[PDB]
Amino acid sequence: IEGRLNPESADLRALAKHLYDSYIKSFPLTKAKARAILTGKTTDKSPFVIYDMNSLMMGEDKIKFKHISKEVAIRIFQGCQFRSVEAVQEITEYAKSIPGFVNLDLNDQVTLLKYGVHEIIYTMLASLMNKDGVLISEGQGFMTREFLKSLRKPFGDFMEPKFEFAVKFNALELDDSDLAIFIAVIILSGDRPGLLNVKPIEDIQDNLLQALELQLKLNHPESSQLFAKLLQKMTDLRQIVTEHVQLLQVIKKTETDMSLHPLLQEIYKDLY
Protein backbone atom coordinates (compact mmCIF):
# COMPACT_ATOMS: atom_id res chain seq x y z
CA ILE A 1 0.00 0.00 0.00
CA GLU A 2 1.97 2.64 1.71
CA GLY A 3 4.68 5.02 2.96
CA ARG A 4 6.44 3.63 5.96
CA LEU A 5 9.68 1.79 5.95
CA ASN A 6 8.75 -1.80 5.18
CA PRO A 7 10.50 -4.44 7.30
CA GLU A 8 10.99 -6.43 3.98
CA SER A 9 12.55 -3.39 2.48
CA ALA A 10 16.27 -4.30 2.93
CA ASP A 11 15.65 -7.58 1.11
CA LEU A 12 13.90 -5.83 -1.68
CA ARG A 13 16.92 -3.58 -1.80
CA ALA A 14 19.33 -6.52 -1.53
CA LEU A 15 17.32 -8.06 -4.40
CA ALA A 16 17.40 -4.96 -6.58
CA LYS A 17 21.13 -4.91 -5.95
CA HIS A 18 21.63 -8.59 -6.72
CA LEU A 19 19.84 -8.14 -10.12
CA TYR A 20 21.55 -4.86 -10.94
CA ASP A 21 24.94 -6.62 -10.57
CA SER A 22 23.98 -9.68 -12.69
CA TYR A 23 22.48 -7.28 -15.20
CA ILE A 24 25.83 -5.51 -15.76
CA LYS A 25 27.60 -8.77 -15.87
CA SER A 26 25.31 -10.25 -18.56
CA PHE A 27 24.76 -7.11 -20.62
CA PRO A 28 28.01 -5.75 -22.06
CA LEU A 29 26.49 -2.40 -23.33
CA THR A 30 24.30 -0.75 -20.69
CA LYS A 31 22.09 2.31 -21.06
CA ALA A 32 24.71 4.37 -19.27
CA LYS A 33 27.41 3.56 -21.75
CA ALA A 34 24.94 3.96 -24.59
CA ARG A 35 23.72 7.41 -23.58
CA ALA A 36 27.35 8.27 -23.07
CA ILE A 37 28.24 7.45 -26.72
CA LEU A 38 25.25 9.48 -28.03
CA THR A 39 26.24 12.37 -25.79
CA GLY A 40 29.83 12.52 -27.02
CA LYS A 41 30.64 12.37 -23.32
CA THR A 42 33.29 9.57 -23.73
CA THR A 43 36.00 10.07 -26.50
CA ASP A 44 37.79 6.68 -27.05
CA LYS A 45 34.72 5.72 -29.16
CA SER A 46 32.98 7.82 -31.73
CA PRO A 47 30.66 5.61 -33.82
CA PHE A 48 30.81 5.67 -37.58
CA VAL A 49 27.59 7.03 -39.08
CA ILE A 50 25.49 5.18 -41.71
CA TYR A 51 23.07 7.51 -43.40
CA ASP A 52 23.22 6.27 -47.03
CA MET A 53 24.44 3.47 -49.32
CA ASN A 54 27.59 5.33 -49.77
CA SER A 55 28.37 5.40 -46.00
CA LEU A 56 27.05 1.85 -45.61
CA MET A 57 30.15 0.59 -47.58
CA MET A 58 32.44 3.06 -45.93
CA GLY A 59 31.47 1.77 -42.47
CA GLU A 60 31.13 -1.85 -43.41
CA ASP A 61 34.91 -1.44 -43.86
CA LYS A 62 35.75 0.48 -40.72
CA ILE A 63 33.67 -1.76 -38.38
CA LYS A 64 34.45 -5.43 -37.87
CA PHE A 65 31.04 -7.11 -38.35
CA LYS A 66 30.56 -10.64 -37.04
CA HIS A 67 28.17 -11.65 -39.80
CA ILE A 68 29.63 -10.84 -43.35
CA SER A 69 28.11 -10.87 -52.13
CA LYS A 70 24.39 -10.74 -51.04
CA GLU A 71 22.15 -7.60 -51.13
CA VAL A 72 22.12 -4.71 -48.48
CA ALA A 73 18.71 -5.21 -46.94
CA ILE A 74 19.65 -8.83 -46.35
CA ARG A 75 23.09 -8.12 -45.04
CA ILE A 76 21.42 -5.86 -42.48
CA PHE A 77 18.77 -8.35 -41.77
CA GLN A 78 21.44 -10.94 -41.22
CA GLY A 79 23.06 -8.78 -38.57
CA CYS A 80 19.99 -7.80 -36.64
CA GLN A 81 19.47 -11.57 -36.43
CA PHE A 82 23.01 -12.32 -35.17
CA ARG A 83 22.80 -9.68 -32.55
CA SER A 84 19.50 -11.27 -31.87
CA VAL A 85 20.78 -14.81 -31.24
CA GLU A 86 23.38 -13.16 -29.08
CA ALA A 87 20.82 -11.39 -26.91
CA VAL A 88 19.10 -14.78 -26.45
CA GLN A 89 22.21 -16.24 -24.92
CA GLU A 90 22.70 -13.12 -22.70
CA ILE A 91 19.05 -13.19 -21.61
CA THR A 92 19.35 -16.83 -20.68
CA GLU A 93 22.38 -16.23 -18.47
CA TYR A 94 20.68 -13.36 -16.74
CA ALA A 95 17.36 -15.28 -16.20
CA LYS A 96 19.34 -18.00 -14.55
CA SER A 97 20.44 -15.66 -11.89
CA ILE A 98 17.07 -14.34 -10.79
CA PRO A 99 16.61 -16.02 -7.32
CA GLY A 100 14.00 -18.78 -7.60
CA PHE A 101 14.16 -19.15 -11.36
CA VAL A 102 16.39 -22.29 -11.68
CA ASN A 103 14.21 -24.37 -9.32
CA LEU A 104 11.20 -23.86 -11.52
CA ASP A 105 10.22 -26.88 -13.58
CA LEU A 106 12.49 -26.78 -16.57
CA ASN A 107 9.59 -27.34 -18.92
CA ASP A 108 8.26 -23.92 -17.74
CA GLN A 109 11.57 -22.02 -17.80
CA VAL A 110 11.64 -22.88 -21.44
CA THR A 111 8.24 -21.33 -21.96
CA LEU A 112 9.06 -18.20 -19.99
CA LEU A 113 12.22 -17.56 -22.11
CA LYS A 114 10.41 -18.35 -25.46
CA TYR A 115 7.85 -15.68 -24.77
CA GLY A 116 10.05 -13.08 -22.97
CA VAL A 117 13.08 -13.03 -25.16
CA HIS A 118 11.65 -10.65 -27.79
CA GLU A 119 9.96 -8.55 -25.23
CA ILE A 120 13.39 -8.03 -23.58
CA ILE A 121 15.13 -7.55 -26.84
CA TYR A 122 12.80 -4.65 -27.59
CA THR A 123 13.43 -2.91 -24.28
CA MET A 124 17.18 -3.30 -24.58
CA LEU A 125 16.96 -1.92 -28.07
CA ALA A 126 15.39 1.26 -26.63
CA SER A 127 18.63 1.91 -24.63
CA LEU A 128 20.44 1.97 -27.94
CA MET A 129 18.15 4.41 -29.70
CA ASN A 130 17.10 8.00 -30.17
CA LYS A 131 14.62 9.24 -32.68
CA ASP A 132 17.46 9.41 -35.22
CA GLY A 133 18.79 5.87 -34.98
CA VAL A 134 20.45 2.90 -33.37
CA LEU A 135 23.85 2.16 -32.02
CA ILE A 136 25.00 -1.06 -33.75
CA SER A 137 28.05 -3.20 -33.37
CA GLU A 138 28.53 -2.94 -29.65
CA GLY A 139 28.44 0.89 -29.98
CA GLN A 140 30.70 1.15 -33.07
CA GLY A 141 28.23 2.30 -35.71
CA PHE A 142 25.23 4.63 -35.64
CA MET A 143 22.57 3.53 -38.09
CA THR A 144 19.96 5.90 -39.20
CA ARG A 145 16.28 5.52 -38.71
CA GLU A 146 15.73 7.17 -42.13
CA PHE A 147 18.22 5.02 -43.98
CA LEU A 148 16.57 1.94 -42.52
CA LYS A 149 13.15 3.14 -43.76
CA SER A 150 14.82 3.50 -47.15
CA LEU A 151 15.33 -0.23 -47.74
CA ARG A 152 13.10 -2.34 -50.03
CA LYS A 153 9.45 -3.29 -49.53
CA PRO A 154 9.50 -5.88 -46.73
CA PHE A 155 12.74 -4.85 -45.10
CA GLY A 156 12.40 -1.14 -44.39
CA ASP A 157 9.39 -1.57 -42.16
CA PHE A 158 10.93 -3.92 -39.68
CA MET A 159 12.76 -1.38 -37.34
CA GLU A 160 10.16 1.37 -37.41
CA PRO A 161 7.87 -0.16 -34.81
CA LYS A 162 10.84 -0.62 -32.48
CA PHE A 163 11.79 3.04 -32.91
CA GLU A 164 8.14 3.87 -32.50
CA PHE A 165 8.27 2.17 -29.06
CA ALA A 166 11.72 3.39 -28.06
CA VAL A 167 10.71 7.06 -28.30
CA LYS A 168 7.70 6.42 -26.00
CA PHE A 169 9.73 4.24 -23.68
CA ASN A 170 12.72 6.45 -23.36
CA ALA A 171 10.48 9.20 -22.26
CA LEU A 172 10.18 7.51 -18.80
CA GLU A 173 13.92 8.29 -18.31
CA LEU A 174 14.50 4.84 -16.77
CA ASP A 175 17.99 3.68 -15.92
CA ASP A 176 19.97 0.45 -15.59
CA SER A 177 18.79 0.12 -11.97
CA ASP A 178 15.17 0.31 -13.08
CA LEU A 179 15.75 -1.82 -16.15
CA ALA A 180 17.38 -4.81 -14.44
CA ILE A 181 14.20 -5.26 -12.36
CA PHE A 182 11.74 -4.55 -15.16
CA ILE A 183 13.38 -7.26 -17.14
CA ALA A 184 13.14 -9.90 -14.42
CA VAL A 185 9.50 -8.85 -14.07
CA ILE A 186 8.81 -9.38 -17.79
CA ILE A 187 10.54 -12.74 -17.89
CA LEU A 188 8.70 -13.97 -14.85
CA SER A 189 5.15 -13.71 -16.27
CA GLY A 190 2.46 -16.18 -15.06
CA ASP A 191 0.16 -15.28 -18.12
CA ARG A 192 2.34 -17.30 -20.45
CA PRO A 193 0.53 -19.84 -22.75
CA GLY A 194 1.62 -23.40 -21.76
CA LEU A 195 2.74 -23.01 -18.16
CA LEU A 196 2.23 -26.18 -16.28
CA ASN A 197 2.88 -24.97 -12.78
CA VAL A 198 2.18 -21.28 -12.31
CA LYS A 199 1.89 -20.69 -8.59
CA PRO A 200 5.61 -20.55 -7.90
CA ILE A 201 5.90 -18.27 -10.96
CA GLU A 202 3.44 -15.76 -9.58
CA ASP A 203 5.32 -15.85 -6.23
CA ILE A 204 8.68 -14.80 -7.47
CA GLN A 205 6.93 -12.21 -9.60
CA ASP A 206 5.06 -10.41 -6.76
CA ASN A 207 8.32 -10.08 -5.10
CA LEU A 208 9.97 -8.50 -8.16
CA LEU A 209 6.98 -6.18 -8.53
CA GLN A 210 7.52 -5.15 -4.89
CA ALA A 211 11.21 -4.66 -5.59
CA LEU A 212 10.21 -2.54 -8.59
CA GLU A 213 7.71 -0.31 -6.83
CA LEU A 214 10.28 0.44 -4.13
CA GLN A 215 13.07 1.09 -6.62
CA LEU A 216 10.92 3.55 -8.59
CA LYS A 217 9.87 5.43 -5.44
CA LEU A 218 13.52 5.89 -4.35
CA ASN A 219 14.99 6.59 -7.77
CA HIS A 220 12.32 8.78 -9.32
CA PRO A 221 10.77 11.63 -7.22
CA GLU A 222 9.97 13.41 -10.46
CA SER A 223 6.93 11.33 -11.52
CA SER A 224 4.11 10.41 -9.17
CA GLN A 225 2.91 7.43 -11.25
CA LEU A 226 5.73 5.76 -13.15
CA PHE A 227 5.20 2.23 -11.73
CA ALA A 228 1.93 2.07 -13.54
CA LYS A 229 3.05 3.64 -16.77
CA LEU A 230 5.57 0.77 -16.74
CA LEU A 231 2.96 -1.91 -16.00
CA GLN A 232 1.21 -0.46 -18.98
CA LYS A 233 4.36 -0.75 -21.06
CA MET A 234 4.45 -4.49 -20.43
CA THR A 235 1.15 -4.80 -22.29
CA ASP A 236 2.15 -2.63 -25.31
CA LEU A 237 5.13 -4.96 -25.84
CA ARG A 238 3.12 -8.16 -26.34
CA GLN A 239 1.21 -6.33 -28.99
CA ILE A 240 4.46 -5.13 -30.52
CA VAL A 241 5.79 -8.71 -30.69
CA THR A 242 2.61 -9.99 -32.34
CA GLU A 243 3.19 -7.36 -35.06
CA HIS A 244 6.84 -8.56 -35.27
CA VAL A 245 5.93 -12.24 -35.72
CA GLN A 246 3.17 -11.40 -38.21
CA LEU A 247 5.47 -9.32 -40.39
CA LEU A 248 8.20 -12.02 -40.27
CA GLN A 249 5.51 -14.30 -41.91
CA VAL A 250 5.54 -12.02 -45.00
CA ILE A 251 9.41 -12.04 -45.20
CA LYS A 252 9.54 -15.86 -44.73
CA LYS A 253 7.20 -16.24 -47.71
CA THR A 254 8.65 -13.40 -49.82
CA GLU A 255 12.34 -14.39 -49.66
CA THR A 256 13.73 -17.74 -51.03
CA ASP A 257 17.35 -18.27 -49.93
CA MET A 258 16.38 -17.01 -46.43
CA SER A 259 16.88 -19.52 -43.60
CA LEU A 260 16.13 -17.99 -40.30
CA HIS A 261 18.63 -19.03 -37.67
CA PRO A 262 17.53 -22.35 -36.02
CA LEU A 263 17.40 -20.76 -32.52
CA LEU A 264 15.11 -18.07 -33.85
CA GLN A 265 12.83 -20.50 -35.57
CA GLU A 266 12.45 -22.24 -32.37
CA ILE A 267 11.23 -19.18 -30.54
CA TYR A 268 9.09 -18.10 -33.42
CA LYS A 269 7.56 -21.64 -33.49
CA ASP A 270 4.15 -21.78 -31.95
CA LEU A 271 4.21 -18.14 -30.86
CA TYR A 272 1.76 -15.33 -29.93
Binding site: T92, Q109, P262, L263, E266, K269
Partner: peptide, 10 residues
Protein backbone atom coordinates in the same frame (compact mmCIF):
# COMPACT_ATOMS: atom_id res chain seq x y z
CA UNK B 1 10.46 -30.06 -28.07
CA UNK B 2 12.63 -26.71 -28.25
CA UNK B 3 15.98 -28.56 -28.23
CA UNK B 4 18.24 -25.46 -28.37
CA UNK B 5 16.65 -23.32 -25.67
CA UNK B 6 16.74 -26.52 -23.54
CA UNK B 7 20.48 -26.90 -24.21
CA UNK B 8 21.04 -23.23 -23.38
CA UNK B 9 19.64 -23.83 -19.91
CA UNK B 10 23.01 -25.44 -18.93
Amino acid sequence: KHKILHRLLQ
